[PDB]
Amino acid sequence: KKHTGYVGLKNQGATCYMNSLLQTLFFTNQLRKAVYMMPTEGDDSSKSVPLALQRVFYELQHSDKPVGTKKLTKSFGWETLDSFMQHDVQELCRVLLDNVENKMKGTCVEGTIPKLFRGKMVSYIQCKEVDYRSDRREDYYDIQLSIKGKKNIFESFVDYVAVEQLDGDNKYDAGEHGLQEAEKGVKFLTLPPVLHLQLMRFMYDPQTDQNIKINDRFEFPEQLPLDEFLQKTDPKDPANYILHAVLVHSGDNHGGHYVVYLNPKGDGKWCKFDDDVVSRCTKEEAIEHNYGGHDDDLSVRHCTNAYMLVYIRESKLSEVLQAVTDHDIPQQLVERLQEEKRIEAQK
Amino acid sequence: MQIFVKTLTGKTITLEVEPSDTIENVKAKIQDKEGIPPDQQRLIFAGKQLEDGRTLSDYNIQKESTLHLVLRLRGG
């Protein structure tokens, strides 16, 4: 009837934020396969988030009509009214991947999430007046990028790795040297196969206790080279990334709507996923149009823009976005699910 | 011990804390310096959003660790 090949997700009330994330993770093929692999045989279908994700993924992959997510929200232990509260999509991502990661611990797919999304950074501190240096390596699953005053993703990363002065009110604690003035600089040691970028589109205004969303123009490319920001680069694997998904937030955080644009196969063929409606779109509708900064405009167009970006490493693309067939789904799973399409029938 | 927090303005500030401090405590110390209500704060470290109730030692947050402060863009 329509031609996208993909199905949407029904909105339960205010779950657009959840639907955008789910499409985003469903099309992270390698992760979907890992989830299908989780041991859900002896799980209570009403308390199991892993069974709920498997179910949502299976439907998205086989159904020909919008998919529901009530069993998913039920496995979170939520009551119906909880589906009517708006939420931040990056927040859902942090909490969900952590939950699924822990549930994967002890299983054959244990460690899958860190493998796909976790990277490492190095923080360098140095005292200006005392000869003392100290490093700190830290993992990350996404990068919050500074937007204000930044024209694009490059100026943003340049800003992320920029050395800062640990001055006056924030002087560095050396130890036996006490509070000293120092410089702090951050570099990346590794960038993951799948890169999640959170655009810092906020600022807190003291005269309202409110977060006023930053709708300024901020450009991000289809192709994103990041070798410049690695402490040490690798010739056989440059940190060249390809845009996969654009999570778009519309409105002020006084009410908004989430939608996600993806090119599932990483082939530049984009589609827009707005809850139950999946439609083919142009590259510009997914990219440029979500740069933001359309002011003096008295419309929603000004407050509609990219919040979260998903890039996939060029060298990992064919693996991360590997085709998933029924061959990849466990008989035990398929059967349990089809026995449900039954049990919900004769009743 | 001293830890760091990258604020909304993209600047790194210091916080004096103890391993047993709760995330609620930390959010509190941030309100003092940045003036942001704790209920609006989201602290991200090692890919995890720090849970109120838990403490710094629960997340193995040591001296010089850097936390990442973000707000929210709620949508439905």
Is residue A198 within 8 Å of residue A272, measured between CB atoms?
no
Q: Are A307 and A257 in contact (CB under 8 A)?
A: no
Would you give the DSSP letter of residue B20? T
The DSSP secondary-structure symbol of B75 reads: B
Q: How many residues does chain B have?
A: 76
With beta carbons less than 8 A apart as the criterion, state whether A217 and A293 touch: yes
Residue A261 token pair:
């644009």
Count the alpha carbons within 13 Å of A306 in the hemisphere toward its beta carbon: 30
CB contact under 8 A, A98 and B48: yes
- CA pair distance B14, B32, nearest whole angstrom: 12
Question: A164, B12: Cβ pair inside 8 Å?
Answer: yes
* Closest partner CB to B64 (pick from A136, A159, A209): A136
CB A273 within 8 A of CB A258: no
What is the rounded CA–CA span in Å between residue A341 and residue A71? Answer: 13
| CA A199 to chain CA centroid, nearest Å | 11
Is-contact A89 A17, C-beta < 8 A? Answer: yes
Could you say which DSSP state residue A46 is in? T
Q: Do A211 and B72 touch (CB under 8 A)?
A: yes
Q: How was this structure determined?
A: X-ray
Chain A partners within 8 Å of B30 (Cβ)? none
B74 and A87: CB-CB below 8 Å?
yes
Longest distance between any two alpha carbons in chain B, whole Å: 40
Task: Answer for the pair A214, A147: CB distance below 8 angstroms, yes or no.
Answer: yes
Structure tokens at B20: 């047993």
- CA A342 to chain B, closest CA, distance in angstroms equals 32
Amino acid at A170: N
A211 DSSP β-pair partners:
A204
- Alpha carbon distance A319, A279 (integer Å): 26
Query: Would you say the C-alpha torsion A257, A118, A189, A124 has a positive or negative sign?
Result: positive
Mind telling me the catalytic residues of A? 16, 257
Rounded to whole angstroms, how far apart are CA atoms A42 and A28? 26
Q: Is B2 in contact with A90 (Cβ distance < 8 A)?
A: no
Residue by residue, DSSP assigns A296-342 as S--STTTTEEEEEEEEEETTTHHHHT----GGGS-HHHHHHHHTHHH
Q: Which whole-number Å values give the CA distances from B38 to A64, A136, B16, B24, B43, in the listed order?
A: 44, 27, 17, 8, 10
Please give the Cα distance from A300 to A162 (Å, whole number): 34
Instruction: Identify the helix (H) or strand (E) that includes residue A246.
Output: strand A240-252
CB neighbours (10 Å) of residue A168?
Answer: 8
- CB neighbours of A116 closer than 8 A, spacing ≥ 6? A28, A30, A31, A192, A193, A194, A320
All domains in chain B, ordered by first residue = 1-75 (3.10.20.90)
- Partners of residue B6 in chain A, C-beta under 8 Å: 144
Residues of A with CB below 8 A from B47's CB? 94, 97-98, 114, 117-118, 139-142
In chain B, which residues have their Cβ closer than 8 Å to the Cβ of A88? 42, 72-75
Q: Coil, strand or helix: which one is A58?
A: helix
Angstrom distance (rounded) from CA A253 to CA B75: 7
| Alpha-carbon distance B25 to nearest alpha carbon in chain A (angstroms) | 19
Compute the residue count for chain A: 347
Angle at A254 between CA A250 and CA A259, to 5 degrees: 25
Cβ neighbours, 10 Å, residue B69: 22
Contacts of B66 in chain A (CB under 8 A): 123, 136, 138, 186
Name the residue in chain A with its Cα closest to that of B76: A14
Tokens of A31: 């992760």
3-state secondary structure of A290: helix
Indicate left, alpha or beta for A53 from its phi (over 0: left) and psi (-120 to 50: alpha): alpha
**From the list B8, B64, B73, which residue is nearest A88 (CB)?**
B73
Using CA coordinates, name the residue in chain B closest to A214. B73
SS3 readout for A71-134:
HHHHHCCCCHHHHHCCECHHHHHHHHHHHHHHHHCCCCCCCHHHHHHCEEEEEEEEECCCCCEE
Half-sphere exposure of A267 (CA within 13 A, CB side): 8
Q: Which of A134, A170, A251 sits opposite B64 (nearest CB)?
A: A134
CB–CB of B40 and A94 under 8 A?
A: no
Tell whether the torsion through CA atoms of A229, A234, A238 and A241 is positive or negative. Answer: negative
A91/B76 Cβ within 8 A: no
- B20: closest CA of chain A, how far (Å): 19
Domains of chain A plus CATH, in order, are: 8-118+315-347 (no CATH), 119-140+161-191 (2.20.210.10), 141-160+192-314 (no CATH)
Residue A175 Cα, gap to closest chain B Cα (Å):
10
Identity of the residue in B71, B73, B74 whose CB atom sits nearest the CB atom of A204? B71
Count residue pairs from A and B with Cβ separation < 8 A: 134
* C-beta of residue B33 within 8 angstroms of C-beta of residue B13: yes
Contact state of B71 with A98 under an 8 Å Cβ cutoff: no
Measured between CA atoms, the residue of chain A closest to residue B61 is: A138
